[PDB]
C-alpha cells in the first residue's frame, strides 16, 4: 500500500499505516487501515511461480572520474607518433599520440 | 560589416554543424565508439540508425 | 564497488544463474570496459515477479 509509484532507484522504509479510506487511521490499523507491509510465504513444496528467487541487480556509471572498476585486460607499452588505436580506461578511439 | 557578416554566418553554420555531433538524437550516447564498444551489433544497430 | 579489478566473464559462464539479462551493455563485451562505480542491489523475489 502506497500513495504513489516510486521514483526510479528509490527506497522506502516507513511503515506508516496507509489511510486508503476517508476515515483517518490515527496511526492504528483497523477499518480501511491496513499494514503497509505483507509477509511472503515460502515452502519447500511451493510451486515454481511461488518459489523464492535470490536476485541481484548490477548498475554501472562513469562520472568522468578515475576508472576505479575495470576488467582483467592487460595493459601494453606506450607508442608515440604512430596512428594507433588507444584505450585509456575505456576511452576507445584511434589517433596519433604525441 | 558587409564582408564580415558573410564570414560570421559561415562560421556560425559550421559551428552549429559541429555542435550537432554531440546530440543523442534518442540513442544512448552521442559517441559512436561507445555504442560500438558497449553493445553487440544487433542491439547497436538501433542506436547507430 | 570501487578500486578493484572486476571479472564479469566468470559470472557469465558460471551457468548457475537462471536469468542473466543486461540492458545497455553486452554480456560478453563489458569484460574490457571500465566504470567509476558499480552498485549491487540484492533481495529475494517471488518466481512470478
Amino acid at each position: 500500500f502506497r500513495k504513489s509509484n516510486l521514483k526510479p532507484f528509490e527506497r522506502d522504509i516507513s511503515t506508516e499505516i496507509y489511510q486508503a479510506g476517508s476515515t483517518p487511521c490515527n496511526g492504528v490499523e483497523g477499518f480501511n487501515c491496513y499494514f503497509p507491509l505483507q509477509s511472503y510465504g515460502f515452502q519447500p513444496t511451493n510451486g515454481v511461480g511461488y518459489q523464492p528467487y535470490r536476485v541481484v541487480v548490477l548498475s554501472f556509471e562513469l562520472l568522468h572520474a578515475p576508472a576505479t572498476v575495470c576488467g582483467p585486460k592487460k595493459s601494453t607499452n606506450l607508442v608515440k607518433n604512430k596512428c594507433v588505436n588507444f584505450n585509456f580506461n575505456g576511452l576507445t578511439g584511434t589517433g596519433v599520440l604525441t | 560589416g558587409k564582408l564580415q557578416d558573410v564570414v560570421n554566418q559561415n562560421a556560425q553554420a559550421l559551428n552549429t554543424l559541429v555542435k550537432q555531433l554531440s546530440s543523442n538524437f534518442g540513442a544512448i550516447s552521442s559517441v559512436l565508439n561507445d555504442i560500438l564498444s558497449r553493445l553487440d551489433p544487433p542491439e547497436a544497430e538501433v542506436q547507430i540508425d | 564497488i570501487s578500486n578493484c579489478v572486476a571479472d564479469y566473464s566468470v559470472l557469465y559462464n558460471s551457468a548457475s544463474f537462471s536469468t542473466f539479462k543486461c540492458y545497455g551493455v553486452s554480456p560478453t563485451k563489458l569484460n574490457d570496459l571500465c566504470f567509476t562505480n558499480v552498485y549491487a542491489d540484492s533481495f529475494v523475489i517471488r518466481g512470478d515477479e
Binding site: 526510479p8 556509471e61 | 550516447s29 561507445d34 | 545497455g24
Partner: peptide, 18 residues
C-alpha cells in the same frame, strides 16, 4: 533525482534517492 547528462557518461541518469 534526475541528474544531468553532462555529469554521467555511461550510467543511467537516475540516481539513488531513497
Amino acid at each position: 533525482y534526475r541528474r544531468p547528462r553532462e555529469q554521467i557518461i555511461i550510467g543511467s541518469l537516475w540516481v539513488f534517492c531513497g
